[PDB]
Amino acid sequence: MKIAIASSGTDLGSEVSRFFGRAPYFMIVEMKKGNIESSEVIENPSASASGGAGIRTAQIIANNGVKAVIASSPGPNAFEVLNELGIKIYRATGTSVEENLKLFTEGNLEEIRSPGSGRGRRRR
């Protein structure tokens, strides 16, 4: 279970920045026993040059094991793929990264998912 805070700046000034679209600063938080065991931050490579990018960084967020993605992208665009992926989507109403961390440990924020193995209806 890894919690990833979109934007979140790089220190303690960018409180969630604003929205999640091309934020070249996705903070990664590998929580283990309710105690952040690793707090790092990865910046985007060329968010202002490649063709059709920004929300494409999501594919990479899933390759990092980020089972949690708290962001505030404007529209179901990002939440659309994160859903077809199978990861836990999260919404960032707006508050701060420091508080967001302890906020995920209490399941305060909201999350959305999309299971594909429900209602067992086998033919036989």
What's a quick, concise take on this entry?
The chain has helices at residues 57-63, 76-85, 97-105, and strands at 2-5, 26-31, 36-42, 68-71, 88-91, 110-112.
Tell me the layout of helices and strands.
Layout: E1 2-5, E2 26-31, E3 36-42, H1 57-63, E4 68-71, H2 76-85, E5 88-91, H3 97-105, E6 110-112
Parallel strand pairs: 1-4, 4-5
Antiparallel strand pairs: 1-2, 2-3, 5-6
Which descriptors apply to this entry?
124 residues; alpha/beta; Nucleotidyltransferase, domain 5; 3 helices; 21% helix; structural genomics; mixed beta sheet
Could you describe the 3D structure shown?
It is a single chain. The protein is of the alpha/beta class and 124 residues long. The chain has a single domain, classed as Nucleotidyltransferase, domain 5. It is built from 3 helices and 6 strands. It has helices at residues 57-63, 76-85, 97-105, and strands at 2-5, 26-31, 36-42, 68-71, 88-91, 110-112. The chain has a 6-stranded mixed β-sheet with strand order 3-2-1-4-5-6, with helices on both faces. A hairpin with a 4-residue loop joins β2 and β3. The PDB classes it as structural genomics. The entry lists the keywords mixed a/b protein, strands 2 and 6 antiparallel to rest., Structural Genomics, PSI, Protein Structure Initiative, nesg. It forms a monomeric assembly. Solution structure of hypothetical protein MTH1175 from Methanobacterium thermoautotrophicum. The protein is hypothetical protein MTH1175. The organism is Methanothermobacter thermautotrophicus.
